[PDB]
Amino acid sequence: MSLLEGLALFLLLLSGVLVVTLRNAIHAALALILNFLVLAGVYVALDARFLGFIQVIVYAGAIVVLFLFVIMLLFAAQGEIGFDPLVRSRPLAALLALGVAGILAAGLWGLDLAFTQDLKGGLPQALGPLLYGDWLFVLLAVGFLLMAATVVAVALVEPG
Amino acid sequence: MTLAILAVFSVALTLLGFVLPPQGVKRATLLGLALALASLLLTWGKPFAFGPYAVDGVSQVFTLLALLGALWTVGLVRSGRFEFYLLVLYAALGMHLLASTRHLLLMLVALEALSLPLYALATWRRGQGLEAALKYFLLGALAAAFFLYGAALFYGATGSLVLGAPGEGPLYALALGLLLVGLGFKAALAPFHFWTPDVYQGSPTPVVLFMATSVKAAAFAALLRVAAPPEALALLVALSVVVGNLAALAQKEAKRLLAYSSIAHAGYMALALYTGNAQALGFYLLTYVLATGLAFAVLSQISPDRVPLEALRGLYRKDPLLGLAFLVAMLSLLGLPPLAGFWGKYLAFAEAARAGAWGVLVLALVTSAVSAYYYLGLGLAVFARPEETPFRPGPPWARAAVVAAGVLLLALGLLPGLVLPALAAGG
Amino acid sequence: REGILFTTLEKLVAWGRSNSLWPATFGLACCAIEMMASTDARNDLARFGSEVFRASPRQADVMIVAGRLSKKMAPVMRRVWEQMPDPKWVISMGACASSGGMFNNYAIVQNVDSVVPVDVYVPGCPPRPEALIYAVMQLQKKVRGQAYNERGERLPPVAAWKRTRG
Amino acid sequence: MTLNVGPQHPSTHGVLRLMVTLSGEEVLEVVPHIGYLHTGFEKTMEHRTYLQNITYTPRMDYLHSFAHDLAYALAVEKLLGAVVPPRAETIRVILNELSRLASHLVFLGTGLLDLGALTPFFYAFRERETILDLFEWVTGQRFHHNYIRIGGVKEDLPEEFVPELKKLLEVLPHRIDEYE
Amino acid sequence: MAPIQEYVGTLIYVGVALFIGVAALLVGALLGPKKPGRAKLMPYESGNDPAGEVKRFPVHFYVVAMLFILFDVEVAFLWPYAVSAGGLGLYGFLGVLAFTLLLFVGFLYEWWKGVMR
Amino acid sequence: MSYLLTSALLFALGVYGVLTRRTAILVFLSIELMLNAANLSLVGFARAYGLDGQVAALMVIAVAAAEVAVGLGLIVAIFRHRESTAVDDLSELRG
Amino acid sequence: TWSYPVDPYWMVALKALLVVVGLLTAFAFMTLIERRLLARFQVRMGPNRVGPFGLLQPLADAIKSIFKEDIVVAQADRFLFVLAPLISVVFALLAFGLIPFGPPGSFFGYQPWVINLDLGILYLFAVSELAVYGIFLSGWASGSKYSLLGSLRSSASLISYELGLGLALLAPVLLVGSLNLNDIVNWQKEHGWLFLYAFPAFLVYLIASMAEAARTPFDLPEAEQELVGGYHTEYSSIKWALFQMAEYIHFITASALIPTLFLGGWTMPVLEVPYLWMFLKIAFFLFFFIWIRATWFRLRYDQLLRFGWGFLFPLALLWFLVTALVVALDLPRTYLLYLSALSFLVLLGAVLY
């Protein structure tokens, strides 16, 4: 825990700082892949194992691969082009960036929770009956949503 | 089994459009929407629930409203792309689930399922339409992130993600606020309204109709489930109504002005959130949906891309009945006797006073008095001198739709004691 | 670091380079077909270590100048020589490359030694594939430092080590 | 993608530069650039003996060379009125079709290798070497043979030539039929 | 389930593999003539512009990858049914089959419209 | 508890991005970071309140993938012809 | 890992180093033996040269690889150009310890494998994605779009058939119900050779493993014979050695996994000897894939994507649905023997028309 907890949280935080700070898009994306790998490791540390592996397979393996595909097809790596900088928009937004933490920190400040439950590892063997079961209706809704997103994007590009 | 109609017809048409002609696709979409609407009518007072899917008066009424709006906006769209209809069906289902569950995560899934297809529906290729699509998409994804963090803090306050939780102190308030963020964003409440002017100006007018009716209907339906505190409600209402009407005065274009007006109208609607009457809000949103569908059908018949105020003038000489219906809609949306908008507004104000919020109600009413300036500068213009103006005076389809909308509005204005009885359990 | 500074070290690295020589194709003319025939299924340059053939120049150490080097081809080959990593050797295959051959004209470089340092010359028109094998055995003993010319001089391992490339 | 498929690259046989205009995986249109092999036969041949030019003729189409040799020979023969002996002309057509087969063998090896697998380059090419042995028996040369002459041929066929030829004409048809 | 010790052994596997790889990189880098040339650093193929002046590459790869993220989400949903099935009975089979059929209907759409594009 | 504070910090960082990033795709990446911070908070509260948040976060990832696909399609649609994805060149729609 | 024991950490590191160096020497000698097998195929014979039997030429090749001026291309990225090969090798070497070479303790006491994770197939899937990551990353960092499009082809094709890998691996889990490799192998020990039950998915796995760098998409791509591929064309000393090493490591990893999952992972009905049968099946699938290397043409990666997408993956998911029917209804297992036997006889008898 704490030995690896602090280090993993530092890796996560620095990766996020990079992905929101770095102007080299490729560098931000790979920092974010590091973010997700450390995040899946932390998931394992949280007895949630299945979700971390899907996180790595889906997000890293598939999604941000497509991010990289687009930004290599469409260069777009250095966003620092076409500025209209609006200097005052940099700090104020950044200021707002901090604020949205504090209230959340306030919502979590002075909070204690019961972190003692027999998860037995977040294996899908037990997640199935929840997914297929209490969540099965949600599952069908989500699958329909995915199909609708496919058709929306296709008709959105659809040169003819 | 309305969900049955929606899902089956949608999935079937998905493939069937390849072999079936777009005219047949239109007729089939019409039949699917009409069958879902008939099923909704026949299930009056017949709750049907499986999981998070929970059909009550809220789901029933508000999804009826969404189906009416969808039917109307489909009747008008004639583009030679079948896809431009299928997505609407999808959206319908999503908004249904938005009202038909308390489950925050399924609420998010339905919110996305309704927000996506409209984005593509706003792509008439119009340079402002595409700008609207991108702004709408980014802001909607941000609001969905906010709603997700709210559901996370909800699960922090309780072991389940279904609304109705007991609720802790600051954690429960923060989760409620984070949910309210996205919900009011989709409800055009300030300070989360900013997408609305750009989107309503840029999006194709019929899509603007469909959005401003169904999206807001389902959003308020789900809002009734929230435990919205009075203070946050006060701030949202104040900002929403102030910004809406005040910025509306300065608009010279119909669609954007109506967007700010819809901000004001949602601010008025938010009063039922004080009590969650779900009857007053049902009636209010019925009136607003009808009037909005009528007015936006007029706007669509004029020009989908953009309709300025001056072009609207003289419509009476162009079409007398259409101008009269638009004026009646402007009056009903002003909240004037003896029209149903006044009954909905009165019901909301009564729920607010029952909640004991006084200065907020006073400010809302003063701003409503402000609204009459532009509401009249548009409604009465129907009689002005005809300028050269795009005028395609529709088929009898849209004419009869407008007629029935206006008649329903005025009838429920004179006799609200007919449908208002059946917004609760449904006697 | 350049394969030097210990008697065992340079002999061993020269061993490695000598028997691991990988050819880089430079097809110009009919010398190229008999260059290919040094690989066919009667006679393969696939035993000495040259089975695989990296067409990329960033991946092969031996360059076989096979054919008449037309002058419009000079900078290309020029760059190809610089677009090879530094441990590179250049074999001059055929008459047209080594000398002007029967095509003694405005159109052909009369010796590829003009643009790139020639390591080995091998006449023939076309040189029998086995003659190319003998040229590469000569190059084998060259990069080992086991090669001598007619005057008694002990040739250096790598040509293109004596030039101020630019 | 105004791409520069350069001379000799990527392993494009017949050194040549191509400026391929292309978007994606189709091929819109290729602008060629040639001359990277210009040797200047048409000039150098004006400075070599008529006998000497038979050395220059094969080195141009180094796959099907004997057609070049025969075309030049025939032109000169017509020019000065020479007679090709029927045995000599028969041997000439033999050499012509034999170089034609060598050309087709290398052609199919290079083609099949160019896209697909590397194997089919070997087998047929083995036979090519075998064919060359035949030439090596008669002309003493792999290719670029200076054999033909205006009146006829350089010298006679060895006694050992016909058996190798009959051996190849018997074994080859089954090979070709199996590839087919 | 599995003990966490195997996962720390996995981390050690990765750490030793990474260290050995970085060592191999150092070996490759240190052993070299190290005489760069301005042309040596040139991209490729005769002077400039191996590809050089080219416009953006086709969207077909984007379509494949977007398809792939969605269908890997699909397989992520299908795996929990793959493990625990008999306890889920005909109800579980029916849910997973309807799910797969919806997403494959979307796929049939993209197919009958096709992406050679 | 460190996990939940970490989720809050990562969400704040993703907001910092969405406010800061000029390019649509970098904004989109910041949004991804926001959603995954939320999912981390969900996993923490699932460890606390009994594992439901795992299936919750799975559904979250699926929904995110759908909206990402559609948003990338739209981003391509607008800035295939157009110059840099920077939103500042999109200001025709004004009050 | 319900019942499988755990060695101390130092033994884990010892075996990790042994597996790294073993895969090293393995792909080196496999380059040798593939050259000789190709030669045996293409009449031409191999290097009875500098060996004697050839088994010392790769050391000369490695000594060539070093000293070969590891070059940092200017006008190309300083960092990622160097970085990508390390990714491609690190995330390839691992995921081979999982392949069980024997029952527990059959490593003379301690562990045949290295790690026996509960979610093994997911580990394989994840680490498979990162190879493509490194491939197309290096394709980009080279800054010569000549190789960029090749790396794009690589990623497109491998990702398509890697999607197919999921629908392929779905089917057996329903029967097994466990995601530990040794359980599935013991399953094929008792009930017998899972492919007999699940033949069709095996094909779309095999084709995937043949599409995933074995050969015949042959739009992998390699620089030769086409628009040159990614992951090469700019690296000189060790980085190209790393790319070739990782590609061949994936080659033998798939060539070992195919008998491991579907067919008889070592665990033979006869003599139950731990290592030799697994190594021999590795060699068998390796020789079949090399046969294919020599014996079949290209697929252009567009018709290849169409083929995998429209035909392979629907077949895999449909087979998953049928196996799910059988498992959820659970009545027979002989139905599966009959069904897969029919499927293979269909795919076989349909040829000689």
Ligand SMILES: C/C=C(\C)[C@H](O)[C@H](C)/C=C(C)/C=C/C/C(C)=C/Cc1[nH]c(OC)c(OC)c(=O)c1C
């Ligand atoms: C797996 C495959 C490999 C490792 C390699 O790619 C194979 C082994 C390499 C080969 C075959 C060599 C190629 C050299 C070449 C392309 C020369 C140019 C050329 N070629 C011709 O065709 C023969 C010509 O005749 C019309 C020419 O005139 C000219 C100038």
Ligand code: SF4
């Ligand atoms: S030396 Fe002879 S075989 Fe070689 S290129 Fe010149 S003419 Fe052709």
